[PDB]
């Protein structure tokens, strides 16, 4: 009879240490997915800009070949 | 009974507290500051919506490159566009490696060769690791695309990439420059290029120095007219001198009736040096002279009437020069800026660039240690005021895209200072408009010295034309005084020989260097000079003429007959015919016209190696009339002739046909 | 209904005509381009019904479908199912088929199936012609507001020509420059050709200039030769806009008549609001009953005859009588009445055992599947039969009429009646299992309830009007709070007989209950019924 409320204040202090240690899991697993998916989203910035680089080089390869027999206008 | 019934009522109303919380978050939460982008969605979307661009673009590059052409092709430019494909595809993590696509030369290293593999091995960082250019080069030979020109590809050096050409393509343009004219495709659409060239000082006698900038000046001017640039020619004449005040003061005495009676004044310099003697000696003259050089700055009606008449004699002597050299020109010497020069002097105090020194106002270029004088000690404007208030009008009114200044190599300190200063106040940018100084050497006689004559001061240029058609005639009565059609071929020869040699032996010699005027080496019938060109040029329009082939029999046969290139020497000539726009591009860039003369001579060298080798017309021995005409080898002598004739139109040399 | 679209040969204009009535226009085309119109169609009054692969098709689209496919079918013409591509919209395959399915569910075979993208070549070709003929320039502004001024109007022709040629060759940046018309009407906002850079469904890649609904769905009426072209009623201040592209290129025209935007109350149909409700959990799928999507009403039962007959009653004009489910659920009451047979079933399954009745197991007995002369199906009788406890109370109020002590009640389609005997309660106080002998009431005695014996199935799903009142929008703040009385719910007890069947869109009457249709979760073993309409109540 006098050992239920002693075991209860062991398993209710368990919810205590559970949901603290759970909130360090639930916020370390946030930094993991954040640190990764962030530095990939600035690695789309190294593709998307390198894309415009090899895009602008190519519009001026066409426009040097579409004057070869065609008309060009300004500017623009 | 009801805590289950009303909890739903606090659950029915809590819904709106969630529904409307999500509602007003849609409005005041989005972008309230400098940046704007969804990274999860959009940055994964611009990656495809623009990766779809390289494909829709490449498909449109394949459309307009497929459908040709009505022109010629800068062969070397379209090779750096198939290596531009090949090399950066072979190595996707390099930005701009060298593209040394040169000819060179004798079909030994093939026709063309690219020494770029070095500049990928030479690109030797990432901690000094040995990368042999040979494995570098052949990694580009398996990663070079498909084209309309290349037959075989080779390696033979440390990393040398020697290239060979497909016969099929080489001859396809030889016909192209034949049926549709030998023309270059509208290069640089609607750009405006003005050229400052002739520009001698009025009432001073125009000389050989100011003549070198007349032939170099208008030869360039017709280049950009041929390329497709909207060119306008400028005569930066010197009708704004403090010396012009010295003239009218001598006029007010010589002729008090200049305003009502036309003045009988013959030579400019004898009248000039008459005003000069008045100048140095007299004191009443010199105080009348510079008191009227400020009257004319003020647009004085009576004083200006004098000034207008003065030029009409030194400019009748000038149009006696342009008529011969066929120099089309538009005169705007410093006389034109006397209005706006005053508004430029003002701009450099408003900007606070001008420093106060010695009763003068001078400006300091951060590139040299030599300042400019824009304000004289007597309120007069100089040369630094002129070409600086004129480099703005050629920038903000004419709105040029590039201007070429053709004066000697002695005023280079001046121009690269007016340039740098122009950029300073912020009129143009060194890479939005390329303002470049077309400099040249000094005129020397056959005695290495100043030019020239017995005395000889400044040699009058009209006599050069006089001793230019006498020299060109004494050789042309040996013995063509009979073969020549009286009016036609005497005129056509001696007026093409005279203005041909003179223009040429100065454009053959390097522009930047000292031109040695040698009237015997310039008209040497056996030399690089136009003496040999115009003679061997009629000689190519004579292999066709001596075969009875009229203006229709060649212009139809060209449209139908394909050209053969099996022999080694006809392959050596067939190449140089199409080098023509690869030589014209180099001179659009470096503006050294001395590499065109090297080329117009280059095809005539491989021609005498050809016309002697493969027989154009060859029947027969023991009877010599007919027949063995190789029409495809007759199209060659119509191609070489159409090329040089448009290349002569550029040099300024009027071509001849019969001689 | 085609009695009412034939009466539009008693209102409109026959094969050809065209110049007779509408916003008629006479150019060097009227008598000589309409000559070619009849030289290709032969007359044959062609119409079209053109939705999108994004489309969801709700009941109000049945006024659209019945109209086009109907006038054609009525006055001997054809009608194009024309899928509106225009701007590329990913894929969504479920509605790509939902449309084709629903079109046939009503009973129309579309003459042809076309996409808008099929004609991107001649739409571009006529676009090139429009820039040259004038009334077509290349401008910008937008998105500097498509509503602020009007710039670049009478620009140089060739400039807008080479720019339009550049626009598609990829010489642009997905936003810079559009292609407009010299448009007036309205508020003169012209956008004929925009620029995207997005893959397409039908003509993928290759393309990066794509027109717009206004430009696209005007010419295609011409292109495919349409002589009516029935627009809904958002297209009112757009009559000018449609007749503008034709004649400006000179073409055989439509005429474009408008009908009234007939929605319905108690209803929400937009997929941004529905695919919400899918994920909230108030509803099952987009074909969940009580949704009023056409693919849902199919699930709910609702015969395609009943949906069409409703249209012949309240439609065929320009009046947009956005009406109620009550007058529509009363139109399907008309059809399931005699398109679906009787069967009867029990829900509150109460074990009733019959002591004294003849023979052994089963005994067939046949049921009037229809209170007509067509014929009888059979379901096993006594003993151990099943009535629901909602037809038996121990103490009845005088209003009772079912089973009471000493108050026997008839068994439907049977010459027998049970008198009621001893009853069992079991453990607690639940009316567990009752028993009785049958007096075979040829002796005349009214309560006549339904029953099953040697029963069967599993699931019956009951559905109410999802919102307790009307189209959640008219300022109650907002739309996701009319989802009251659950609605819901299901009964996976349910004992039905051998009348069924066992196939899964058949319809029934469950005698003295409701009209019920089979649902696509059914097999032949674990079958499942939707309750479609309420049996004539209210």
Swiss-Prot record, chain A:
Compartments, as annotated in UniProt: Nucleus; Cytoplasm, Cytosol; Secreted; Endoplasmic reticulum
Spans annotated as Required for fibroblast proliferation: 2-42
Transmembrane segments: none
Post-translational changes noted in the entry: Cleaved by caspase-7 in response to apoptosis to produce EMAP-II.
Subunit structure, as described in the record: Homodimer. Part of the multisynthetase complex (MSC), a multisubunit complex that groups tRNA ligases for Arg (RARS1), Asp (DARS1), Gln (QARS1), Ile (IARS1), Leu (LARS1), Lys (KARS1), Met (MARS1) the bifunctional ligase for Glu and Pro (EPRS1) and the auxiliary subunits AIMP1/p43, AIMP2/p38 and EEF1E1/p18. Interacts (via N-terminus) with RARS1 (via N-terminus). Part of a complex composed of RARS1, QARS1 and AIMP1. Interacts (via C-terminus) with SMURF2. Interacts (via N-terminus) with HSP90B1/gp96 (via C-terminus). Interacts with PSMA7. Interacts with TARS3.
Disease: Leukodystrophy, hypomyelinating, 3: A severe autosomal recessive hypomyelinating leukodystrophy characterized by early infantile onset of global developmental delay, lack of development, lack of speech acquisition, and peripheral spasticity associated with decreased myelination in the central nervous system.
Functional note: Non-catalytic component of the multisynthase complex. Stimulates the catalytic activity of cytoplasmic arginyl-tRNA synthase. Binds tRNA. Possesses inflammatory cytokine activity. Negatively regulates TGF-beta signaling through stabilization of SMURF2 by binding to SMURF2 and inhibiting its SMAD7-mediated degradation. Involved in glucose homeostasis through induction of glucagon secretion at low glucose levels. Promotes dermal fibroblast proliferation and wound repair. Regulates KDELR1-mediated retention of HSP90B1/gp96 in the endoplasmic reticulum.
Protein known as: Aminoacyl tRNA synthase complex-interacting multifunctional protein 1
Swiss-Prot record, chain B:
Domain of life: Eukaryota
Catalytic reaction list: tRNA(Arg) + L-arginine + ATP = L-arginyl-tRNA(Arg) + AMP + diphosphate
EC number: 6.1.1.19
Localisation per UniProt entry: Cytoplasm; Cytoplasm, Cytosol
Residues covered by region (Interaction with tRNA): 528-542
GO molecular function: arginine binding; arginine-tRNA ligase activity; ATP binding; cadherin binding; tRNA binding
Keyword terms of this UniProt record: Acetylation, Aminoacyl-tRNA synthetase, ATP-binding, Cytoplasm, Disease variant, Leukodystrophy, Ligase, Nucleotide-binding, Protein biosynthesis
Motif, 'HIGH' region: chain positions: 200-211
Chain coiled-coil ranges: none
Annotated region described as Could be involved in the assembly of the multisynthetase complex, given as residue ranges: 1-71
GO cellular component, one term: cytosol
One of the protein's GO biological processes: tRNA aminoacylation for protein translation
Classification via HAMAP family: Arg_tRNA_synth
Entry similarity comment: Belongs to the class-I aminoacyl-tRNA synthetase family.
Domain notes: The alpha-helical N-terminus (residues 1-72) mediates interaction with AIMP1 and thereby contributes to the assembly of the multisynthetase complex.
Free-text function comment from the UniProt entry: Forms part of a macromolecular complex that catalyzes the attachment of specific amino acids to cognate tRNAs during protein synthesis. Modulates the secretion of AIMP1 and may be involved in generation of the inflammatory cytokine EMAP2 from AIMP1.
Disease named in the record: Leukodystrophy, hypomyelinating, 9: An autosomal recessive neurodegenerative disorder characterized by delayed psychomotor development, severe spasticity, nystagmus, and ataxia associated with diffuse hypomyelination apparent on brain MRI.
Protein name: Arginine--tRNA ligase, cytoplasmic
Organism, scientific name: Homo sapiens
Curated annotation (Swiss-Prot), chain C:
Result of changing residue 180 to W: In MSCCA; results in loss of glutaminyl-tRNA aminoacylation activity; impairs protein folding; does not interact with RARS1; results in reduced protein solubility
Locus of motif 'HIGH' region: 51-61
Binding site for ATP: 52-54, 58-64, 232, 261-262, 269-271
Keywords assigned: Acetylation, Aminoacyl-tRNA synthetase, ATP-binding, Cytoplasm, Disease variant, Epilepsy, Ligase, Nucleotide-binding, Phosphoprotein, Primary microcephaly, Protein biosynthesis
Outcome of swapping residue 290 to W: In MSCCA; results in loss of glutaminyl-tRNA aminoacylation activity; impairs protein folding; results in reduced protein solubility
Record's keyword annotation contains Aminoacyl-tRNA synthetase: yes
Annotated family: Belongs to the class-I aminoacyl-tRNA synthetase family.
Function: Glutamine--tRNA ligase. Plays a critical role in brain development.
Subunit structure: Monomer. Part of a multisubunit complex that groups tRNA ligases for Arg (RARS1), Asp (DARS1), Gln (QARS1), Ile (IARS1), Leu (LARS1), Lys (KARS1), Met (MARS1) the bifunctional ligase for Glu and Pro (EPRS1) and the auxiliary subunits AIMP1/p43, AIMP2/p38 and EEF1E1/p18. Interacts with RARS1. Part of a complex composed of RARS1, QARS1 and AIMP1.
Identification of the protein by name: Glutamine--tRNA ligase
Record organism: Homo sapiens
Lineage: Eukaryota, Metazoa, Chordata, Craniata, Vertebrata
Gene: QARS1
Full-protein residues shown: 220 to 771 of 775
């Amino acid at each position: 009879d006098a050992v239920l409320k002693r075991l209860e204040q062991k398993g209710a202090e368990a919810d205590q240490i559970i949901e603290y240690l759970k909130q360090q899991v639930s916020l370390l697993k946030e930094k993991a997915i954040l640190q990764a998916t962030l530095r990939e989203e600035k690695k789309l910035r190294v593709e998307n800009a390198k894309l415009k680089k090899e895009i602008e080089e190519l519009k001026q390869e066409l426009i040097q070949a579409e004057i070869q027999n065609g008309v060009k206008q300004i500017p623009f | 009974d009801v805590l289950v019934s009303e909890c739903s009522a606090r659950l029915l109303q809590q819904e709106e507290e969630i529904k409307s919380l999500t509602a007003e978050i849609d409005r005041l939460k989005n972008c309230g500051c400098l940046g704007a982008s969804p990274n999860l969605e959009q940055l994964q979307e611009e990656n495809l919506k623009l990766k779809y661009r390289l494909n829709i673009l490449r498909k449109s590059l394949q459309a307009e490159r497929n459908k040709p052409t009505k022109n010629m092709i800068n062969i070397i430019s379209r090779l750096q566009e198939v290596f531009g494909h090949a090399i950066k595809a072979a190595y996707p993590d390099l930005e701009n490696p060298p593209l040394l696509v040169t000819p060179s030369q004798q079909a030994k290293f093939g026709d063309y060769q690219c020494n770029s593999a070095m500049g990928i091995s030479q690109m030797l960082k990432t901690k000094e690791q040995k990368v042999n250019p040979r494995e570098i080069a052949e990694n580009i030979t398996k990663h070079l695309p498909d084209n309309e020109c290349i037959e075989k590809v080779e390696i033979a050096g440390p990393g040398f990439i020697n290239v060979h050409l497909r016969k099929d393509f080489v001859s396809e343009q030889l016909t192209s420059l034949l049926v549709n004219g030998v023309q270059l495709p509208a290069l640089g659409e609607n750009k405006k290029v003005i050229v400052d060239f002739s520009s001698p000082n009025i009432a001073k006698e125009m000389h050989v120095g100011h003549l070198r900038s007349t032939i170099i000046g208008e030869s360039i001017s017709r280049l950009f007219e041929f390329a497709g640039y909207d060119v306008l020619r400028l005569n930066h004449v010197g009708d704004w001198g403090t010396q012009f005040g010295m003239l009218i003061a001598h006029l007010q005495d010589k002729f008090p009736d200049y305003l009502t009676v036309s003045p009988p004044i013959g030579d400019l310099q004898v009248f000039y040096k008459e005003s000069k003697k008045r100048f140095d000696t007299e004191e009443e003259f010199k105080k009348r002279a510079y008191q009227c050089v400020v009257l004319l700055q003020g647009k004085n009606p009576d004083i200006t009437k004098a000034w207008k008449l003065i030029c009409d004699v030194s400019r009748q002597e000038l149009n006696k020069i342009y008529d011969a050299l066929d120099v089309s020109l538009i005169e705007r010497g410093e006389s034109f800026y006397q209005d706006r020069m005053n508004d430029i002097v003002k701009e450099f105090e408003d900007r606070g660039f001008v420093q106060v020194d010695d009763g003068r106002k001078i400006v300091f270029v951060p590139g040299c240690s030599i300042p400019l004088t824009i304000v004289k000690s007597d309120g007069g404007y100089t040369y630094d005021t002129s070409d600086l208030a004129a480099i703005k009008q050629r920038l903000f009114e004419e709105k040029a895209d590039m201007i070429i200044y053709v004066v000697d190599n002695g005023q280079s300190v001046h121009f690269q200072t007016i340039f740098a200063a122009a950029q300073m106040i912020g009129w143009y940018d060194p890479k939005v408009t390329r303002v470049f100084h077309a400099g040249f050497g000094v005129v020397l006689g056959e005695d290495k010295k100043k030019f020239k004559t017995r005395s000889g001061e400044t040699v009058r240029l009209m006599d050069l034309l006089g001793e230019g058609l006498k020299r060109s005639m004494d050789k042309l009565k040996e013995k063509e005084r009979d073969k020549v059609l009286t009016a036609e071929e005497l005129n056509a020869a001696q007026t093409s020989v005279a203005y041909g040699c003179i223009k040429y032996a100065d454009l053959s010699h390097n522009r930047l260097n000292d031109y040695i005027f040698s009237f015997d080496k310039m008209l040497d019938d056996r030399g690089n000079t136009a003496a040999y060109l115009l003679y061997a040029f009629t000689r190519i329009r004579s292999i066709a003429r001596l075969a009875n082939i009229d203006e229709e029999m060649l212009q139809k046969a060209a449209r139908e007959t394909k050209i053969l290139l099996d022999h080694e020497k006809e392959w050596k000539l067939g190449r140089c015919i199409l080098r023509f726009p690869e030589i014209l591009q180099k001179i659009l860039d470096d503006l050294f016209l001395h590499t065109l003369c090297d080329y117009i001579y280059e095809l005539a060298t491989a021609f005498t190696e050809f016309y002697d080798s493969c027989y154009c017309v060859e029947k027969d021995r023991q009877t010599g009339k007919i027949l063995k005409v190789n029409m495809w080898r007759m199209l060659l002598c119509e191609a070489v002739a159409a090329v040089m004739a448009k290349g002569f139109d550029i040099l300024g040399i009027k071509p001849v046909q019969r001689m | 209904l085609m009695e009412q679209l034939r009466g539009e040969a008693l209102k409109f204009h026959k094969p050809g005509e065209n110049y007779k009535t509408p916003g008629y226009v006479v150019t060097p085309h009227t008598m000589n381009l309409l000559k070619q119109h009849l030289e290709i169609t032969g007359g044959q009054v062609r119409t079209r019904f053109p939705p999108e692969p994004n489309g969801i098709l709700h009941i109000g689209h049945a006024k659209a479908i019945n109209f086009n496919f109907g006038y054609a079918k009525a006055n001997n013409g054809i009608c194009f199912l024309r899928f509106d591509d225009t701007n590329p919209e990913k894929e969504e395959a479920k509605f790509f088929t939902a449309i084709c399915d629903m079109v046939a569910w009503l009973g129309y075979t579309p003459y042809k199936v076309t996409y808008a993208s099929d004609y991107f070549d001649q739409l571009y070709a006529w676009a090139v012609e429009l820039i040259r003929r004038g009334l077509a320039y290349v401008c910008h502004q937008r998105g500097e507001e498509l509503k602020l001024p009007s710039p670049w109007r009478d620009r140089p022709m060739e400039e807008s020509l080479l720019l339009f040629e550049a626009m598609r060759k990829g010489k642009f940046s997905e936003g810079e420059a559009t292609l407009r018309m010299k448009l007036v009407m309205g508020k003169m906002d012209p956008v004929a050709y925009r620029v995207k850079y997005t893959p397409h469904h039908r003509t993928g890649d290759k393309w990066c200039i794509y027109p717009t609904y206004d430009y696209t769905h005007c010419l295609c009426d011409s292109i495919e030769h349409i002589t009516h072209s029935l627009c809904t009623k958002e297209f009112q201040a757009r009559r000018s806009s449609y007749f503008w592209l034709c004649n400006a290129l000179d073409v055989y025209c439509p005429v474009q008549w408008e009908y009234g935007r007939l929605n319905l109350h108690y209803a929400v149909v937009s997929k941004r609001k529905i695919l919400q409700l899918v994920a909230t959990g108030a509803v099952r799928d987009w074909d969940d009953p009580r949704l009023f999507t056409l693919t849902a009403l199919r699930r709910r039962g609702f015969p395609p005859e009943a949906i069409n007959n409703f249209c012949a009653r309240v439609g065929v004009t320009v009046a947009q009588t956005t009406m109620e489910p009550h007058l529509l659920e009363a139109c399907v009451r008309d059809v399931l009445n005699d398109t679906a047979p009787r069967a009867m079933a029990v829900l509150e399954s109460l074990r009733v055992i019959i002591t004294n009745f003849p023979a052994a197991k089963s005994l067939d007995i046949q049921v009037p599947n229809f209170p007509a002369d067509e014929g009888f199906h059979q379901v096993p009788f006594a003993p151990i039969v099943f009535i629901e406890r909602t037809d038996f109370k121990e103490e009845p109020e005088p209003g009772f009429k079912r089973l009471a002590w000493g108050q026997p009640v008839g068994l439907r389609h049977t010459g027998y009646v049970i008198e009621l005997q001893h009853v069992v309660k079991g453990p607690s106080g639940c009316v567990e299992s009752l028993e009785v002998t049958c007096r075979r009431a040829d002796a005349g005695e009214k309560p006549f309830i339904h029953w099953v014996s040697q029963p069967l199935m599993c699931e019956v799903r009951l559905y109410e009007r999802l919102f307790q009142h009307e189209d959640p929008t008219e300022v109650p703040g907002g739309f996701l709070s009319d989802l009251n009385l659950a609605s819901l719910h299901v009964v996976d007890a349910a004992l039905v007989d051998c009348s069924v069947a066992l196939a899964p869109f058949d319809k029934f009457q469950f005698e003295r209950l409701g009209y019920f249709s089979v649902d696509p979760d059914s097999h032949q073993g674990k079958l499942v019924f939707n309750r479609t309409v309420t049996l004539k109540e209210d």
